[model samples]
Target: ANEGSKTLQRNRKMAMGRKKFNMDPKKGIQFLVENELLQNTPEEIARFLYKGEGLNKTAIGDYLGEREELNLAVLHAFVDLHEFTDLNLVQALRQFLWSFRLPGEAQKIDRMMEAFAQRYCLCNPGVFQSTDTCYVLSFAVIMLNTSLHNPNVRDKPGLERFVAMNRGINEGGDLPEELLRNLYDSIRNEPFKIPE
Candidate 1:
């Protein structure tokens, strides 16, 4: 918006009538840095993620179920973008970038499966998500693309990275097995297809 800074004057006009942002990630991050909406430093981002992981646990329940459910992929996203844009700029940065990063993980909890899922807004389908293309059903989706797909992720002391955030769920943390299986089968037959 012209209402913002005079910094990157040319790119400042990149957003169209209603978008309010740039299409390119670098351009977008630059826009934020210029406008002061986001800081471009890694420590600030790391500290933000470090503390935010805590402060959630509505009445820790039994193994079969808990008052709080997990949305691990997206939570990792809040910090992964930090890794992507900055290249692990801080020591704390490596702590948050990984898979199966759910369940709270300290002696506090156990875990289930997880994978990345990036979102995109569109018109043809309106707005929604498809785990097949990004990743879903299993961490294998990443393995088909990244080696330490499941084993390393499974072995990693994920939640232990942070003493404050180490609290995890019980051994039986569940997350809808049937639904996950359905998506798993759907994507397994073929390498994921990106919609056109």
Candidate 2:
């Protein structure tokens, strides 16, 4: 009877493993998109995200595959939309970087960011020429640096400068210098805040 019980337990464990292996990626994507945890339209975004010259899609996939199901689901949601305007992609990418529980992974992420920046420069010359891509890339780098354990980032120089420049462009030369400086200082001095 003991032998029979052990066999049953083993079979049960195998069945659970099989269930996990059989889990559908499409289902996960649908659930997240429906709940608005991911973008409402991911098909359009997926094209660019997967095909874009910049950003390491392979590394992103590997990271997602190794993560827990819930985290993978969240990533699926974030990457499916094309309208990644105003640092949306940076924010989404940072969520994964900040929530990662493993140690020594920040350096890996930093490497990936560097690769992404180089690729962006090569693929989108016009965007980079205007410094729009630089702002987004800088945001990604700074967020990663700030989120990492014992991060190497200090003094938020890039973020401070970018915010000042962005304000100047948006306000058509009417942006208040003091207000931009104050806002940048406030954010720069604060610790990283992870969204739930």
Candidate 3:
């Protein structure tokens, strides 16, 4: 074979490696749910504080946490790996909730949220500012992220934002910008008052 042909073949082979991800949602979720490049999302979360892993957990969530531009990819559900990872508590929690909450078919959220909330704060050492606050915020953040990444919501009215005061505010529904602004103002603006 000519060197030119060989080079062309080599380039073609390399081109096959463009961006990688299984196009089938079900299969893609299954493959990654099975195993991969880093830690098994299962056991990835054997510990936690604010389910904080989601705060800076997976590379997937890294950008989501920062710029609030999370994609529609699913996260590890407890069943997939039995867990995410200890380091990404927040990320893991969101992952689990997402898998269960907006599953392929219809689902209810009462039990899942309850168990998650209790377990998330069971050993908080009273570090949390308040119980109700944690429960509400956690649910809102967790569910909102799920809804935002939910392909089912791409056409919704106001579900585009990545963060919010409550899940209701972020769901794929219409919401007033002024209301959101006022809610933002209602939150503590002082540097010392914010959660680190």
> Number of clashing pairs, model 3?
15
Between prediction 1 and prediction 3, which has the larger lDDT?
Answer: 3
Model 1 alpha-carbon miss at residue 92, Å? 25
Worst 10 residues of 1 by lDDT: 55-64
- Sort by lDDT, best first: 2, 3, 1
Q: Which ten residues in a row have the lowest lDDT in candidate 3?
A: 67-76
Per-residue lDDT of 1-196 in model 1, one digit per residue for the tens? 5545554554433232012221232343345456564455544322333343321222111111222223233233343443333221111112322311234443222222222223211111221244332122134322332322235555432212221121221122322334334333333333333211
Q: What is residue 28's positional error in candidate 1, in angstroms?
A: 1.5
Q: After superposition, how far is residue 107 of candidate 2 from its true place, in Å?
A: 7.5
For model 2 the local lDDT of residue 115 reads: 37
Give Cα-based local distance difference scores for all models.
Answer: 0.29, 0.41, 0.34
Root-mean-square deviation of candidate 1 = 16.8
Question: What's the C-alpha lDDT at position 141 in model 2?
Answer: 41
Give the C-alpha miss distance for residue 184 in model 3, angstroms: 14
